[model samples]
Target: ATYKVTLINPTGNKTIEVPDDQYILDAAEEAGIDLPYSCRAGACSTCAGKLISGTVDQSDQSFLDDDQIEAGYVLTCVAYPTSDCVIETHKEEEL
Candidate 1:
């Protein structure tokens, strides 16, 4: 299903439609947001972000620990929105 994904970035905020089948970072790029990223397959944390609201399927990622995942940290490159979501992007350094 398609869901509304709201990204809160330092530069600006962007809300776009995203299908659960697509990666969050990829969809953001296709929608023209120049978000930072590395190792798009979820082996790195360069694309990490905080999930401010809603849920995402990030079970495919390997970098973040259980505590980090519990704290809402998400590897956007491997994350897919499971519901309408709000995420603060460009937070890899903070993660």
Candidate 2:
């Protein structure tokens, strides 16, 4: 299913359609929404963001721990929308 993802970013806000199969960062890139990212894989936290609202499937990410996930942190490069979501971008924090 496709989900509407809203990114509240420092540069600007962007609302994009993202399929459940696509990673958030990948879909954002397709929409020409430039989000900060380093490693496209799950090993890095450069693309980390805060989940202000909504759910996502970020089981593929390896950098974030249970505590961070519990705190609403997500790594966008590996996160897929499970439902419509609102995320705050450029929220990378030291892990």
Candidate 3:
């Protein structure tokens, strides 16, 4: 199955469809949005973002601290949205 996700950056917004099993960062890149990311796996904080709405499946837990996760911050490279979502892509917290 596929789900729709809306990525909101400091510059603009993009909406794209992604495979339910695919990572959010992969989907963003496929849509031509240059989401800042490194390490591809869940080890780096470079791909972090704030989940504005909706739920995400985060099977990999190595990248985020408890406070970050509890605050709805996620490493997009390791996240799969469980529903349609709105994400803040370029925020100071990620910088």
Top candidate by lDDT: 1
lDDT of each: 0.92, 0.91, 0.82
- Tens digits of lDDT, candidate 3, 1-95: 68888888887788898888999988888878788887978887778888889878877848777878888888899899899888887543553
Clashes of each: 0, 0, 0
Error (Å) of candidate 1 at residue 83 is 0.3
For 23-84, candidate 2 gives per-residue lDDT tens digits of 99999999988888998898887899999899999999898888999989999999999999
Tens digits of lDDT, candidate 1, 5-95: 9999887788999999999998999998888887788888899999999999998999999999999999999999999999999878876
- What is the alpha-carbon lDDT of model 1 when measured against the actual structure? 0.92
- What ranges in model 3 sit over 4 Å off? 92-95
In model 3, state the lDDT of residue 47: 81
Cα-lDDT of candidate 2: 0.91
lDDT of 3 at 59: 78
Model 3, residue 2: what's the lDDT?
A: 83
lDDT of 1 at 11: 75
Model 1 misplacement above 4 A? none
